[PDB]
């Protein structure tokens, strides 16, 4: 799926309340997700069949 199906056919991998209107620390959650995806892909090499799902 292409990016333009993120809310039509595709979902969201990371899920957190940061980006909502009024909620804060969206950038911090983004950095957390970036580091976390890098570390999961570096700790389980060739094992991850598919992307993660980071729920909070």
């Amino acid at each position: 799926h292409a990016p333009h199906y993120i809310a039509h056919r595709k979902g969201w991998l990371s899920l957190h309340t940061g980006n909502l209107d009024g909620e804060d620390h969206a950038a911090e959650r983004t950095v957390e997700d970036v580091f976390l995806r890098k570390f999961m892909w570096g700790t389980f090499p060739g094992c991850l069949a598919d992307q993660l799902v980071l729920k909070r």
Binding site: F35, K38, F39, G42, T43, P45
Partner: peptide, 19 residues
């Protein structure tokens, strides 16, 4: 912090658990 991130990946690397 690019530091705290940076050494942690490389520190774990020579211990034999990261990439």
């Amino acid at each position: 912090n690019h530091h705290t991130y940076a050494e942690l990946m490389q520190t774990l690397r020579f211990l034999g658990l990261y990439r």
